[PDB]
CSV table of C-alpha atoms in Angstrom, one decimal:
chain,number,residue,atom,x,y,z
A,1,UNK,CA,220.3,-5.3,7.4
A,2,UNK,CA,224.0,-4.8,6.6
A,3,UNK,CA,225.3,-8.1,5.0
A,4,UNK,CA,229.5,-8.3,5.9
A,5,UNK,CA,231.6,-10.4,3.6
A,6,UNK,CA,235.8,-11.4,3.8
A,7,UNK,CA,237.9,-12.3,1.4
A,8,UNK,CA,239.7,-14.9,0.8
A,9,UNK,CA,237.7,-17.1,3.1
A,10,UNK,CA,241.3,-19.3,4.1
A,11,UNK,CA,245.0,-18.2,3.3
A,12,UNK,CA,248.1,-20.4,3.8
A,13,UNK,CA,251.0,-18.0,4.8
A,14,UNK,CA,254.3,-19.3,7.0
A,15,UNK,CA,256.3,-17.1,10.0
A,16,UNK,CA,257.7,-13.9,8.9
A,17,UNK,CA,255.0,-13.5,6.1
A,18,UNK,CA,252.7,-10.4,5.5
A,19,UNK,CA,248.7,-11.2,5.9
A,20,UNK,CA,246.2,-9.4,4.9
A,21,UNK,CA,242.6,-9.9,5.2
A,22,UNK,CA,240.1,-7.7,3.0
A,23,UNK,CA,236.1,-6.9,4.5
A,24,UNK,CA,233.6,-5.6,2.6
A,25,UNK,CA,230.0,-4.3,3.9
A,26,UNK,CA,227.0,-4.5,2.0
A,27,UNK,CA,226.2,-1.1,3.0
A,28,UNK,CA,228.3,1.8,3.7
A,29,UNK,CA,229.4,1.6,7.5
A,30,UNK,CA,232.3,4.9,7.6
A,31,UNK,CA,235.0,3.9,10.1
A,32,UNK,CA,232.4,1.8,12.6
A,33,UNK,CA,234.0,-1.4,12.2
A,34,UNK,CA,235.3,-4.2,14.6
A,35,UNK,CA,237.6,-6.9,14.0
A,36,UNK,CA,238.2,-10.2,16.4
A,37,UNK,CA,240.7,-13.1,16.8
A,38,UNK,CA,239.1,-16.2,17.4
A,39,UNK,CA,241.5,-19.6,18.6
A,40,UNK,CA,239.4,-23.2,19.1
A,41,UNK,CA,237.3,-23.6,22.5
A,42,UNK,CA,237.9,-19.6,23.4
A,43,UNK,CA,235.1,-16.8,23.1
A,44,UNK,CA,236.2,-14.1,20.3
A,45,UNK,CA,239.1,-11.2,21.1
A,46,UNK,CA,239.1,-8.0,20.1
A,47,UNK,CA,242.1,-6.8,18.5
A,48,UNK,CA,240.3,-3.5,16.4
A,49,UNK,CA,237.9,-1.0,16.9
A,50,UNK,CA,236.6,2.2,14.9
A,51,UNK,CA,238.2,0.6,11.7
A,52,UNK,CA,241.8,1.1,13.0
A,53,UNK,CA,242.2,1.8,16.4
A,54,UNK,CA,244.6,-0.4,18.3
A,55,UNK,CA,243.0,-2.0,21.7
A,56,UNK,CA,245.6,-1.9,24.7
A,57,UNK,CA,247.7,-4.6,25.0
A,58,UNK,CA,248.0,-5.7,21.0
A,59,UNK,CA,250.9,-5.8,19.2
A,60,UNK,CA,252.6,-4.0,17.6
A,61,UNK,CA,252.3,-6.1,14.6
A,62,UNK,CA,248.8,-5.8,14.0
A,63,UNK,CA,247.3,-2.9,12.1
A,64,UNK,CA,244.3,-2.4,10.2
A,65,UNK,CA,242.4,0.7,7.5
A,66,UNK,CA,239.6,1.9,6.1
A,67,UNK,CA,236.8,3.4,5.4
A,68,UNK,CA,232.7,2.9,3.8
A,69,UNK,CA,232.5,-0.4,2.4
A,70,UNK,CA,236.2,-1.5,1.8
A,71,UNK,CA,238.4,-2.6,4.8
A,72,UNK,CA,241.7,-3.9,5.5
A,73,UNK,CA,242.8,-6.1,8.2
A,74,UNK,CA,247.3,-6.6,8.2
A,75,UNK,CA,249.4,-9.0,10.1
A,76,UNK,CA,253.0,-7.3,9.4
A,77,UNK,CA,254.7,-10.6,9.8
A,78,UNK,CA,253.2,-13.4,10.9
A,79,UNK,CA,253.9,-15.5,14.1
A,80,UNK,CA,253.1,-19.0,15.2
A,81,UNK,CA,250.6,-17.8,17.8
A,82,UNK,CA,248.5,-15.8,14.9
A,83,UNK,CA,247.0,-18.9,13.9
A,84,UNK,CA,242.9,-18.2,13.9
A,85,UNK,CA,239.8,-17.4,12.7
A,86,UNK,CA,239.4,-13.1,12.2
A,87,UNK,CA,235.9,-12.0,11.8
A,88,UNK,CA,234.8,-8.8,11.0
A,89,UNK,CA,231.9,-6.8,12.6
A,90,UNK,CA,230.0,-3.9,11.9
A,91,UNK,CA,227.9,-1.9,14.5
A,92,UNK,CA,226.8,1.3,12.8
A,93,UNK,CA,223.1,0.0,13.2
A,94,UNK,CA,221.0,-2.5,14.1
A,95,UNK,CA,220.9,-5.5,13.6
A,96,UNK,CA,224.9,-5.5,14.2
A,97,UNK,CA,226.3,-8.6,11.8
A,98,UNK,CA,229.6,-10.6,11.6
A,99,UNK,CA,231.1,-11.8,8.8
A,100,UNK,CA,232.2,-15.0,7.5
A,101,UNK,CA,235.4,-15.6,9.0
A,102,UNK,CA,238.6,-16.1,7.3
A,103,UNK,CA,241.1,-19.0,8.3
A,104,UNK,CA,244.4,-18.4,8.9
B,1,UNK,CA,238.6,-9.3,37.5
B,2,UNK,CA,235.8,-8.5,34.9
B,3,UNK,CA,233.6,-12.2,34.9
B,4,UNK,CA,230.4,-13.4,33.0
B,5,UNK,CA,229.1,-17.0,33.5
B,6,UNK,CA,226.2,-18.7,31.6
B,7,UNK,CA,224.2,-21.4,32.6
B,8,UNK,CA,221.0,-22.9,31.7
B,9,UNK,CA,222.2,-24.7,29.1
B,10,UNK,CA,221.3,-28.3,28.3
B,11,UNK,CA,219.2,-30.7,25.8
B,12,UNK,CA,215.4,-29.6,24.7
B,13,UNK,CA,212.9,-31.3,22.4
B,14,UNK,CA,211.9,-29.1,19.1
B,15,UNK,CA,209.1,-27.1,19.9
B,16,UNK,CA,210.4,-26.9,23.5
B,17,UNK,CA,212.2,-23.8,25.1
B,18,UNK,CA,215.2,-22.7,27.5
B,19,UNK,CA,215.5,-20.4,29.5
B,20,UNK,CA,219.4,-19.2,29.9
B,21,UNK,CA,220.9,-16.9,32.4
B,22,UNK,CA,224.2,-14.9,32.1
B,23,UNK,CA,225.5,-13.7,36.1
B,24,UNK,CA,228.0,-10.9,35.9
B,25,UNK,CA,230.3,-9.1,38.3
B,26,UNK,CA,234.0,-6.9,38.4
B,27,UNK,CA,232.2,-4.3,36.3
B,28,UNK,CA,229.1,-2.0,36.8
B,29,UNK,CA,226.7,-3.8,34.6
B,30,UNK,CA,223.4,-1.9,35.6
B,31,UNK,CA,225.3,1.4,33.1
B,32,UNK,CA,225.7,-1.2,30.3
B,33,UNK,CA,223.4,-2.6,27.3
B,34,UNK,CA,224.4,-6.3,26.5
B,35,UNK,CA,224.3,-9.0,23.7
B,36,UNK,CA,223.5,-12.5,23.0
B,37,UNK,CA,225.9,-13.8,20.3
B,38,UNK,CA,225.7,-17.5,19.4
B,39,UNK,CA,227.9,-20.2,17.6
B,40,UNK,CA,227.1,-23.1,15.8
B,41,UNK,CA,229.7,-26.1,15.3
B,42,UNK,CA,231.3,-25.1,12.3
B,43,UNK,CA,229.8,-21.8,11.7
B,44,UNK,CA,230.2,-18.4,12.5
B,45,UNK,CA,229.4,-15.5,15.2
B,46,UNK,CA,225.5,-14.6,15.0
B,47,UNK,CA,224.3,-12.2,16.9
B,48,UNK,CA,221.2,-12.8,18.6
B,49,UNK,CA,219.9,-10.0,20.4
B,50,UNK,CA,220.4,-6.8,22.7
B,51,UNK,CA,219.1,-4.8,25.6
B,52,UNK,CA,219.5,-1.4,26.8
B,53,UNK,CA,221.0,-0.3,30.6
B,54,UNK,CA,217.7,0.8,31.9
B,55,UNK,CA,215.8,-2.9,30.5
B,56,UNK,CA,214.1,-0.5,28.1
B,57,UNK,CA,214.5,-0.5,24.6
B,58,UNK,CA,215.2,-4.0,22.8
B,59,UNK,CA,216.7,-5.4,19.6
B,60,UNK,CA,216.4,-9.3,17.8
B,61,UNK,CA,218.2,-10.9,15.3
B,63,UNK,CA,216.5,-15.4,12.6
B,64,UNK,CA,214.7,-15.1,16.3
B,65,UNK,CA,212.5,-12.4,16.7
B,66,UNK,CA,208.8,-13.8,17.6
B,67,UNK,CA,210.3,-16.5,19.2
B,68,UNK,CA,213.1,-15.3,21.5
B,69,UNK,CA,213.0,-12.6,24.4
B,70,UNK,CA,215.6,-10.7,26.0
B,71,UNK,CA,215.3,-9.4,29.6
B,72,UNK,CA,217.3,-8.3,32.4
B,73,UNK,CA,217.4,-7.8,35.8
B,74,UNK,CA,220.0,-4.6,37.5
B,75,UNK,CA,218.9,-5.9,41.4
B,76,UNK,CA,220.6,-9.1,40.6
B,77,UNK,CA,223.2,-7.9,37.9
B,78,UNK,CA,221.6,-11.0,35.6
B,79,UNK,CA,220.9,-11.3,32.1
B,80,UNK,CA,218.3,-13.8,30.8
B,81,UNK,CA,217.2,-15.2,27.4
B,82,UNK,CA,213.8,-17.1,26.9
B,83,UNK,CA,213.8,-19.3,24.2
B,84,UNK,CA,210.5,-20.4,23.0
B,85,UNK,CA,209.8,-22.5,19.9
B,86,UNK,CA,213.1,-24.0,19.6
B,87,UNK,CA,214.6,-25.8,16.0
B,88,UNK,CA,217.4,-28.0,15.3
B,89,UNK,CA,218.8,-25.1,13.4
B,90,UNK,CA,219.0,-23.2,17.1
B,91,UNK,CA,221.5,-26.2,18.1
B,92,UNK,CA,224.9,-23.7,19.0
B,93,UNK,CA,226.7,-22.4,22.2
B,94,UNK,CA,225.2,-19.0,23.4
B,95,UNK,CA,227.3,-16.6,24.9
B,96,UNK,CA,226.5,-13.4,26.6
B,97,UNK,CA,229.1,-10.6,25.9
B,98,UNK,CA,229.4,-6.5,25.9
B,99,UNK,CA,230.1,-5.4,23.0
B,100,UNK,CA,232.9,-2.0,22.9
B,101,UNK,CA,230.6,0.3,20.6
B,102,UNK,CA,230.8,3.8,20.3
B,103,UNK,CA,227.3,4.4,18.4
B,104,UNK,CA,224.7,2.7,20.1
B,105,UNK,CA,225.7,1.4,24.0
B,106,UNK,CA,228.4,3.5,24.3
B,107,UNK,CA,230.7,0.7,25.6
B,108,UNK,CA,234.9,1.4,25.5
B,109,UNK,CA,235.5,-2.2,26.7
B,110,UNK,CA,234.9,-5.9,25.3
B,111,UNK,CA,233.8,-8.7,27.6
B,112,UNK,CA,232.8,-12.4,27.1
B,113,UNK,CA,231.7,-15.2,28.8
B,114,UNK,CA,232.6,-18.8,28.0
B,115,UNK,CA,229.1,-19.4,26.5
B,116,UNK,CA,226.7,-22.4,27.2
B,117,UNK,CA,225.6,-25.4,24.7
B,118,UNK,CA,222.2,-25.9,23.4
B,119,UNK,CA,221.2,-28.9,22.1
B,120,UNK,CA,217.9,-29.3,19.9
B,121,UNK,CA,216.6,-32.8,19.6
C,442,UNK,CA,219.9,19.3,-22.1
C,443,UNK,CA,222.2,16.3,-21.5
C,444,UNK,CA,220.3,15.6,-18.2
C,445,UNK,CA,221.2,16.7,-14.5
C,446,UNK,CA,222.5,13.8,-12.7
C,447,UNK,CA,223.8,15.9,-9.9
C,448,UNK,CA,220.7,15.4,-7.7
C,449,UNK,CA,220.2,12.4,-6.4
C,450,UNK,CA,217.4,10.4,-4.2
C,451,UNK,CA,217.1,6.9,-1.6
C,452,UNK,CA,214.8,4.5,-3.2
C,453,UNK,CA,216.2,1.5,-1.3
C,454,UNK,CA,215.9,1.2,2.9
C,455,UNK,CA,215.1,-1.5,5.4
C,456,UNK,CA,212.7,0.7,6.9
C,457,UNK,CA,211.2,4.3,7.2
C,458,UNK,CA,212.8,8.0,8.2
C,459,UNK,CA,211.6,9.5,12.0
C,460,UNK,CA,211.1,13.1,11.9
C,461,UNK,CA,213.9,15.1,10.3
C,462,UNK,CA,216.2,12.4,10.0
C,463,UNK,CA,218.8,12.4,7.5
C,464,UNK,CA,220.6,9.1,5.7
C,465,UNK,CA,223.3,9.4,3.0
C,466,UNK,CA,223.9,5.3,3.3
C,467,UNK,CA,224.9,3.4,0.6
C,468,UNK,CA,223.6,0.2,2.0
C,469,UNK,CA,222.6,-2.5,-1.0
C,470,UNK,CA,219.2,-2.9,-0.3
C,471,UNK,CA,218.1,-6.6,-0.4
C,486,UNK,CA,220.1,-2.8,-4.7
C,487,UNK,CA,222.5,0.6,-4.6
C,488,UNK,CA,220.0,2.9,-2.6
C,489,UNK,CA,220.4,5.8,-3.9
C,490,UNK,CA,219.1,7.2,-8.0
Protein backbone atom coordinates (compact mmCIF):
# COMPACT_ATOMS: atom_id res chain seq x y z
CA UNK A 1 0.00 0.00 0.00
CA UNK A 2 1.17 3.49 -1.31
CA UNK A 3 -0.06 6.12 1.26
CA UNK A 4 -0.67 9.83 -0.93
CA UNK A 5 -0.39 12.94 1.01
CA UNK A 6 -1.06 17.05 -0.18
CA UNK A 7 0.13 19.93 1.09
CA UNK A 8 -1.26 22.50 2.36
CA UNK A 9 -4.51 20.84 3.05
CA UNK A 10 -6.54 24.49 2.33
CA UNK A 11 -5.09 27.72 0.65
CA UNK A 12 -6.86 31.12 0.36
CA UNK A 13 -5.68 32.74 -2.98
CA UNK A 14 -8.00 35.54 -4.97
CA UNK A 15 -8.50 35.85 -9.19
CA UNK A 16 -5.39 36.41 -10.99
CA UNK A 17 -3.23 34.63 -8.32
CA UNK A 18 -0.71 31.72 -8.89
CA UNK A 19 -1.73 28.19 -7.03
CA UNK A 20 0.12 25.61 -6.49
CA UNK A 21 -0.61 22.43 -4.84
CA UNK A 22 2.35 20.02 -3.73
CA UNK A 23 1.64 15.73 -3.62
CA UNK A 24 3.83 13.46 -2.14
CA UNK A 25 3.61 9.49 -2.33
CA UNK A 26 4.74 7.35 0.32
CA UNK A 27 6.40 5.25 -2.20
CA UNK A 28 8.02 6.00 -5.32
CA UNK A 29 5.25 6.06 -8.16
CA UNK A 30 7.69 7.63 -11.44
CA UNK A 31 5.32 9.75 -13.56
CA UNK A 32 1.94 7.44 -12.88
CA UNK A 33 0.04 10.03 -11.24
CA UNK A 34 -3.54 11.46 -11.61
CA UNK A 35 -4.98 14.54 -10.48
CA UNK A 36 -8.93 15.56 -10.20
CA UNK A 37 -11.17 18.63 -9.68
CA UNK A 38 -13.83 18.05 -7.54
CA UNK A 39 -17.00 21.01 -7.19
CA UNK A 40 -20.03 20.13 -4.35
CA UNK A 41 -22.73 17.46 -5.48
CA UNK A 42 -20.52 16.45 -8.79
CA UNK A 43 -18.49 13.11 -9.22
CA UNK A 44 -14.54 13.95 -9.53
CA UNK A 45 -12.91 15.48 -13.13
CA UNK A 46 -9.98 14.65 -14.40
CA UNK A 47 -7.81 17.44 -15.42
CA UNK A 48 -4.08 15.30 -15.33
CA UNK A 49 -2.77 12.14 -16.20
CA UNK A 50 0.84 10.46 -16.42
CA UNK A 51 2.03 13.29 -13.97
CA UNK A 52 1.61 16.04 -16.54
CA UNK A 53 -0.26 15.29 -19.43
CA UNK A 54 -3.01 17.72 -20.24
CA UNK A 55 -6.60 15.93 -20.84
CA UNK A 56 -8.52 17.40 -23.92
CA UNK A 57 -10.53 20.10 -23.35
CA UNK A 58 -8.57 21.82 -20.17
CA UNK A 59 -7.24 24.93 -20.08
CA UNK A 60 -4.70 26.37 -20.84
CA UNK A 61 -4.16 27.55 -17.45
CA UNK A 62 -3.58 24.39 -15.81
CA UNK A 63 -0.31 22.58 -15.74
CA UNK A 64 1.26 20.17 -13.58
CA UNK A 65 5.21 18.23 -12.93
CA UNK A 66 6.97 15.63 -11.65
CA UNK A 67 8.38 12.79 -10.96
CA UNK A 68 8.96 9.67 -7.88
CA UNK A 69 7.62 10.87 -4.82
CA UNK A 70 7.41 14.75 -5.24
CA UNK A 71 4.62 16.35 -7.46
CA UNK A 72 3.41 19.57 -8.45
CA UNK A 73 -0.04 20.56 -9.34
CA UNK A 74 -0.24 24.85 -10.83
CA UNK A 75 -3.11 27.02 -11.46
CA UNK A 76 -1.26 29.89 -13.52
CA UNK A 77 -3.86 32.46 -12.47
CA UNK A 78 -6.62 31.65 -10.74
CA UNK A 79 -10.32 32.14 -11.84
CA UNK A 80 -13.64 32.21 -10.02
CA UNK A 81 -14.68 28.91 -11.52
CA UNK A 82 -11.36 27.12 -9.98
CA UNK A 83 -12.93 27.00 -6.71
CA UNK A 84 -12.61 23.04 -5.53
CA UNK A 85 -11.40 20.32 -3.94
CA UNK A 86 -7.97 18.71 -6.18
CA UNK A 87 -7.09 15.26 -5.08
CA UNK A 88 -4.29 13.36 -6.17
CA UNK A 89 -4.12 9.71 -7.30
CA UNK A 90 -1.68 7.26 -7.80
CA UNK A 91 -2.20 4.00 -9.88
CA UNK A 92 1.21 2.43 -10.33
CA UNK A 93 -0.11 -0.60 -8.31
CA UNK A 94 -2.68 -1.97 -6.47
CA UNK A 95 -4.45 -0.98 -4.23
CA UNK A 96 -4.72 2.52 -6.24
CA UNK A 97 -5.12 5.42 -3.33
CA UNK A 98 -6.30 9.10 -3.26
CA UNK A 99 -5.05 11.63 -1.32
CA UNK A 100 -6.39 14.02 1.11
CA UNK A 101 -7.70 16.70 -0.86
CA UNK A 102 -6.71 20.22 -0.77
CA UNK A 103 -9.35 23.17 -0.56
CA UNK A 104 -9.25 25.82 -2.72
CA UNK B 1 -23.09 10.09 -24.88
CA UNK B 2 -20.90 7.89 -22.53
CA UNK B 3 -23.60 7.18 -19.30
CA UNK B 4 -23.18 5.09 -15.97
CA UNK B 5 -26.17 4.94 -13.53
CA UNK B 6 -26.23 3.30 -9.99
CA UNK B 7 -28.90 2.14 -8.12
CA UNK B 8 -29.53 -0.08 -5.28
CA UNK B 9 -28.93 2.29 -2.95
CA UNK B 10 -30.92 2.83 0.26
CA UNK B 11 -30.95 2.35 4.30
CA UNK B 12 -29.61 -1.13 5.79
CA UNK B 13 -29.28 -2.24 9.49
CA UNK B 14 -25.51 -3.03 10.72
CA UNK B 15 -24.75 -6.45 10.03
CA UNK B 16 -27.09 -6.26 7.03
CA UNK B 17 -25.93 -5.99 3.33
CA UNK B 18 -26.67 -4.31 -0.27
CA UNK B 19 -26.44 -5.25 -3.14
CA UNK B 20 -25.68 -2.19 -5.74
CA UNK B 21 -25.75 -2.21 -9.45
CA UNK B 22 -23.96 0.24 -11.84
CA UNK B 23 -25.89 -0.02 -15.82
CA UNK B 24 -23.60 1.36 -18.52
CA UNK B 25 -23.87 2.21 -22.11
CA UNK B 26 -22.27 4.88 -25.09
CA UNK B 27 -18.99 2.89 -24.62
CA UNK B 28 -17.87 -0.78 -25.08
CA UNK B 29 -17.73 -1.75 -21.51
CA UNK B 30 -17.22 -5.70 -22.03
CA UNK B 31 -13.07 -4.28 -23.19
CA UNK B 32 -12.88 -2.34 -19.91
CA UNK B 33 -11.89 -3.22 -16.07
CA UNK B 34 -13.88 -0.91 -13.66
CA UNK B 35 -13.91 0.62 -10.10
CA UNK B 36 -15.92 1.12 -7.11
CA UNK B 37 -14.79 4.43 -5.48
CA UNK B 38 -16.80 5.72 -2.54
CA UNK B 39 -17.38 9.02 -0.51
CA UNK B 40 -18.20 9.75 2.84
CA UNK B 41 -19.83 13.20 3.97
CA UNK B 42 -16.95 15.08 4.64
CA UNK B 43 -14.28 12.85 3.58
CA UNK B 44 -12.43 11.91 0.78
CA UNK B 45 -12.29 9.58 -2.55
CA UNK B 46 -11.63 5.79 -1.35
CA UNK B 47 -11.37 3.42 -3.57
CA UNK B 48 -13.12 0.31 -3.03
CA UNK B 49 -12.45 -2.21 -5.47
CA UNK B 50 -11.76 -3.37 -9.18
CA UNK B 51 -12.47 -6.01 -11.88
CA UNK B 52 -10.90 -7.02 -14.94
CA UNK B 53 -12.68 -7.04 -18.74
CA UNK B 54 -12.96 -10.72 -18.91
CA UNK B 55 -14.70 -10.88 -14.94
CA UNK B 56 -11.39 -12.61 -14.08
CA UNK B 57 -8.88 -11.26 -11.95
CA UNK B 58 -10.10 -9.00 -8.83
CA UNK B 59 -8.78 -6.43 -6.48
CA UNK B 60 -10.26 -4.99 -2.72
CA UNK B 61 -9.60 -2.09 -0.84
CA UNK B 62 -10.95 -1.49 4.46
CA UNK B 63 -13.48 -4.19 2.57
CA UNK B 64 -11.90 -7.18 1.51
CA UNK B 65 -13.70 -10.32 3.35
CA UNK B 66 -16.67 -8.50 3.39
CA UNK B 67 -17.29 -7.01 -0.04
CA UNK B 68 -17.41 -8.69 -3.59
CA UNK B 69 -17.15 -7.43 -6.94
CA UNK B 70 -18.76 -9.00 -9.99
CA UNK B 71 -19.84 -8.27 -13.40
CA UNK B 72 -21.83 -9.29 -16.00
CA UNK B 73 -20.62 -8.37 -20.14
CA UNK B 74 -24.36 -9.97 -21.49
CA UNK B 75 -26.02 -7.17 -19.68
CA UNK B 76 -23.14 -4.49 -19.69
CA UNK B 77 -23.76 -4.37 -15.60
CA UNK B 78 -21.57 -3.96 -12.76
CA UNK B 79 -22.53 -5.20 -9.29
CA UNK B 80 -21.17 -4.83 -5.72
CA UNK B 81 -22.36 -7.18 -2.74
CA UNK B 82 -21.98 -5.74 0.40
CA UNK B 83 -22.15 -8.12 3.25
CA UNK B 84 -21.49 -7.23 6.89
CA UNK B 85 -22.13 -3.68 6.64
CA UNK B 86 -20.81 -0.77 9.56
CA UNK B 87 -21.82 2.61 10.25
CA UNK B 88 -18.25 3.49 9.09
CA UNK B 89 -19.49 2.08 5.37
CA UNK B 90 -22.26 5.00 5.53
CA UNK B 91 -20.91 7.05 2.01
CA UNK B 92 -22.23 7.43 -1.69
CA UNK B 93 -20.74 4.73 -3.98
CA UNK B 94 -19.97 5.47 -7.33
CA UNK B 95 -18.92 3.20 -10.18
CA UNK B 96 -16.29 4.91 -12.54
CA UNK B 97 -13.41 3.86 -15.24
CA UNK B 98 -10.52 4.90 -14.28
CA UNK B 99 -7.90 6.36 -17.47
CA UNK B 100 -4.78 4.15 -16.41
CA UNK B 101 -2.05 3.24 -18.52
CA UNK B 102 -0.50 0.45 -16.19
CA UNK B 103 -3.02 -1.92 -15.23
CA UNK B 104 -6.65 -1.57 -17.31
CA UNK B 105 -5.23 0.19 -19.99
CA UNK B 106 -8.03 2.86 -20.03
CA UNK B 107 -7.29 6.44 -22.14
CA UNK B 108 -10.63 7.78 -20.92
CA UNK B 109 -12.35 8.78 -17.45
CA UNK B 110 -15.97 8.14 -16.78
CA UNK B 111 -18.30 8.53 -13.75
CA UNK B 112 -21.45 7.98 -12.61
CA UNK B 113 -23.43 10.18 -10.25
CA UNK B 114 -22.95 7.57 -7.39
CA UNK B 115 -25.71 6.15 -5.02
CA UNK B 116 -26.15 6.80 -1.01
CA UNK B 117 -25.71 4.18 1.60
CA UNK B 118 -27.00 4.63 4.74
CA UNK B 119 -25.89 2.24 7.79
CA UNK B 120 -28.25 2.34 10.72
CA UNK C 1 38.21 -0.40 4.23
CA UNK C 2 35.77 2.45 4.81
CA UNK C 3 32.84 0.08 3.87
CA UNK C 4 31.11 -0.44 0.29
CA UNK C 5 27.78 1.22 0.40
CA UNK C 6 27.35 0.99 -3.31
CA UNK C 7 25.34 -2.27 -3.17
CA UNK C 8 22.27 -2.10 -1.95
CA UNK C 9 19.17 -4.55 -0.94
CA UNK C 10 14.87 -4.37 -0.42
CA UNK C 11 14.16 -5.29 3.08
CA UNK C 12 10.78 -3.56 3.25
CA UNK C 13 7.61 -4.84 0.73
CA UNK C 14 3.92 -5.37 1.09
CA UNK C 15 4.28 -8.64 -0.35
CA UNK C 16 6.51 -11.23 -2.12
CA UNK C 17 8.55 -11.23 -5.81
CA UNK C 18 6.87 -13.84 -8.73
CA UNK C 19 9.51 -15.43 -10.66
CA UNK C 20 12.19 -13.12 -12.02
CA UNK C 21 10.60 -10.03 -11.10
CA UNK C 22 12.46 -7.05 -10.54
CA UNK C 23 11.43 -3.81 -8.06
CA UNK C 24 13.71 -0.77 -7.50
CA UNK C 25 10.64 1.05 -5.42
CA UNK C 26 11.19 3.21 -2.86
CA UNK C 27 7.86 2.70 -1.19
CA UNK C 28 8.02 3.46 2.81
CA UNK C 29 7.09 0.33 4.10
CA UNK C 30 4.47 0.46 6.87
CA UNK C 31 10.28 2.27 6.53
CA UNK C 32 12.74 3.36 3.33
CA UNK C 33 12.86 -0.26 1.58
CA UNK C 34 15.88 -0.43 0.49
CA UNK C 35 19.72 -0.99 2.82
Amino acid sequence: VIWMTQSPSSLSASVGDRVTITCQASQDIRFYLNWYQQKPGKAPKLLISDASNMETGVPSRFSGSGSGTDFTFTISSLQPEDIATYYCQQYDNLPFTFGPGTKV
Amino acid sequence: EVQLVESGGGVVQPGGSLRLSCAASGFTFNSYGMHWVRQAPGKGLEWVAFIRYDGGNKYYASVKGRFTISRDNSKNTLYLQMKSLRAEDTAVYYCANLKDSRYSGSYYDYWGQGTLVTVS
Amino acid sequence: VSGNYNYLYRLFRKSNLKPFERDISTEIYQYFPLR
